[PDB]
């Protein structure tokens, strides 16, 4: 239960960005070293659910309210605000998986939008804003309603 939530942040963000055509380690640093558990790892399964959840989450949004990268608007001086703003109002009404699925969806989306614009570095910046919020802002909620085991139980 909770070992390295950051790995989950780096993974999802790296995966989504990898689907758009961007490389995480290319400009992420992952605050350590791109490795990620091979297979059969607890945390590994966690990312698997986040990837499956984010995929279905972004899909519904993409099918209904179109993609995200082609809507938002982040800059070198409003990225941390754009994120905090969407994550704030999103978790303002009350934290929850659905809010976390979007939290991760927005994180990876912003990175792609920042890289597409001219702020590849923002990928790692958001990486710290997302992870930090995940571990410090919603982490408690995670273990509260079951944790990554539940999220994995619902999506996995």
């Amino acid at each position: 239960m909770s070992q390295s939530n950051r790995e989950l942040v780096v993974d999802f963000l790296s995966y989504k960005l990898s689907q758009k055509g961007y490389s995480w380690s290319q400009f992420s640093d992952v605050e350590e070293n791109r490795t990620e558990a091979p297979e059969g790892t607890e945390s590994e399964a966690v990312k698997q659910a986040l990837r499956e959840a984010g995929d279905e989450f972004e899909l519904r949004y993409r099918r209904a309210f179109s993609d995200l990268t082609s809507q938002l608007h982040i800059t070198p001086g409003t990225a941390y605000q754009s994120f905090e703003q969407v994550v704030n109002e999103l978790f303002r009404d009350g934290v929850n998986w659905g809010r976390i699925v979007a939290f991760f969806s927005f994180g990876g989306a912003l990175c792609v939008e920042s890289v597409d614009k001219e702020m590849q570095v923002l990928v790692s910046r958001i990486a710290a804003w997302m992870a930090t919020y995940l571990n410090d802002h919603l982490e408690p909620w995670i273990q509260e309603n079951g944790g990554w085991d539940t999220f994995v139980e619902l999506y996995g």
Binding site: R60, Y61, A64, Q71, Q85, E89, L90, G98, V101, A102
Partner: peptide, 23 residues
């Protein structure tokens, strides 16, 4: 100004549809 707020709203609804508690 009218980008992030609207964005969050869209993510919010998607959450309700993809939230659930357990099982």
């Amino acid at each position: 100004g009218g980008t992030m707020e609207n964005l969050s709203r869209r993510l919010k609804v998607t959450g309700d549809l993809f939230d659930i508690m357990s099982g």
